[PDB]
């Protein structure tokens, strides 16, 4: 009964083959979103926000025109894949930046697309290498770290921490159907750090040997709850039950002023056909059974009591300062 959340199966057949109302860059990006060639919460924001640099210099006139011109683009984008808060706050900053400037057209078009690289630098690039300085001192010299799935920041940590001579041992917990903990496993064995891979139902057998649980956040809600990949909340709960400290590495811009008290609000449904096992397969042609429904969540909310740290670009905050960094910023 996740009825209020859309469930999606390509929205490219009805649209005009040259430059339509939506931009070439925006249809290219939305098609990449829907097919699944960009999956990270960070990588979707860069992918949006430098395909959106392509929108600005192609646009010719500036504020009131561009603000309502950009809205069909992100309407199409949230039709392709629902926008996460890394994308949402990016668009909010973009609209504030467009409405801030006013009164030459060429100078404004150059300054917008240069202050968008400035956004990536001082909030996704310089942030992620300031998360790693704070998490390097929290990673001990002989401990075991449990990560979950692919995260661009959790894998930047404990690979920039290993190359500073720390010699931990990562354990990679993964879940179906994304199986994206392989992508954080291939790129972590290449760094040379010892690894271990196991699925999330065995997150309670491997958790006794684990010293800390390092996770990534797709959004930090304004009550301190952590919205991220589905098994994160389950993982943090079992981490608390095995009393291992659990850490969340999140940048500041992923802080949303939206508060959720459960795990059934804005938790997008992706393709239920991903749940088909291809074992032989028994769930294939699941539409033939009327009573049978398939639930494919992509996001999940862990409460702030289940998580100890939040490593942010500005200090290490105890997850109840999440409403506070939302204040001292902006």
């Amino acid at each position: 009964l996740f009825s209020h959340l859309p469930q999606y199966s390509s929205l490219t057949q009805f649209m005009s083959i040259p430059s339509s109302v939506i931009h070439p860059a925006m249809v290219r990006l939305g098609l990449q979103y829907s097919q699944g060639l960009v999956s990270g919460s960070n990588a979707r924001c860069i992918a949006l926000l430098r395909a959106l640099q392509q929108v600005i210099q192609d646009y010719t006139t500036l504020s009131r025109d561009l603000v309502n011109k950009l809205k069909p683009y992100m309407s199409f984008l949230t039709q392709c894949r629902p926008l996460s808060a890394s994308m949402h706050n990016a668009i909010k900053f973009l609209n504030k930046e467009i409405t801030s400037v006013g009164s030459r057209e060429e100078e404004a078009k150059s300054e917008l697309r240069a202050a968008i690289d400035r956004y990536v630098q001082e909030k996704i690039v310089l942030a992620a290498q300031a998360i790693s300085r704070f998490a390097y001192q929290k990673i001990s010299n002989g401990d075991v770290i449990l990560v979950y799935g692919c995260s661009s920041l959790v894998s930047r940590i404990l690979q920039e921490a290993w190359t500073e001579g720390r010699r931990f041992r990562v354990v990679v917990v993964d879940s179906r159907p994304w199986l994206e903990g392989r992508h954080t496993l291939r790129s972590l064995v290449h760094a040379g750090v010892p690894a271990s891979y196991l699925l999330i139902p065995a997150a309670s057998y491997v958790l006794p040997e684990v010293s800390k649980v390092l996770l990534g956040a797709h959004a930090l809600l304004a009550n301190g709850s952590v919205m991220s990949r589905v098994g994160t909340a389950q993982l943090a709960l079992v981490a608390r039950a095995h009393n291992v400290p659990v850490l969340v590495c999140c940048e500041t811009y992923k802080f949303c002023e939206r508060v959720q008290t459960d795990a059934f609000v804005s938790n997008e449904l992706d393709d239920p056909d991903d749940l088909q096992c291809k074992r032989h397969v028994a769930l294939a042609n699941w539409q033939n059974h009327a009573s049978l429904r398939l639930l494919n969540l992509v996001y999940d909310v862990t409460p702030p009591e289940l998580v100890d740290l939040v490593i942010t670009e500005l200090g290490m905050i105890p997850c109840s300062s999440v409403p506070v960094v939302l204040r001292v910023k902006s």
């Binding site: 490219t12 083959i17 040259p18 070439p24 249809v27 290219r28 098609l31 990449q32």
Partner: protein, 163 residues
């Protein structure tokens, strides 16, 4: 203007575009080099003949999603497609090789399952990216671009095919 359809030198091509201009509305293999002063923005070379109203939406989406360097439509020349059924790996139009379809080991280590199709009809619906027509200035390119991967007038280029 994301794309610019180029028609070689015919109502079936000109109204397969349900686009708004052709380079057959101004009429002016090597003809794309003679149509070069048109704005080089992701040309879509069509065919004079043997085009039968296949939907572009499945072919162009192999150029707007995967960011292919080149994208063809097919419906003596042996093609080796990847296991996903959409990636060209080994095109050999020459059947006059000495009875040996030699394959580089590097593609077989990178792409283990190469599925070979026998004599597929070439619709000549080339979705060249805008630098390939420039790279020719500095078939003829379809079996060269598949060899150029694993010439650089942009990364490693990639070429995808629809069947």
């Amino acid at each position: 203007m994301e794309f610019q359809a180029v028609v070689m030198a015919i109502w079936y091509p000109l109204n397969l575009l349900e686009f708004e201009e052709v380079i057959v509305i101004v009429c002016i293999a090597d003809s794309l080099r003679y149509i070069y002063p048109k704005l080089k923005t992701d040309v879509l070379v069509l065919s004079c003949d043997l085009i039968t109203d296949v939907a572009l939406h499945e072919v162009v989406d192999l150029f707007r999603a995967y960011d292919a360097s080149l994208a063809m439509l097919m419906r003596r020349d042996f093609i080796g497609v990847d296991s996903t059924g959409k990636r060209l790996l080994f095109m050999a139009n020459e059947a006059d090789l000495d009875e040996e379809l030699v394959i580089k080991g590097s593609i077989l280590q990178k792409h283990p399952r190469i599925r070979f199709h026998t004599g597929l009809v070439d619709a000549h619906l080339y979705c060249l990216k805008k630098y390939i027509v420039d790279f020719l200035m500095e078939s003829e390119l379809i079996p060269y671009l598949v060899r150029k991967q694993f010439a650089s007038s942009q990364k490693s280029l990639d070429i995808y095919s629809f069947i």
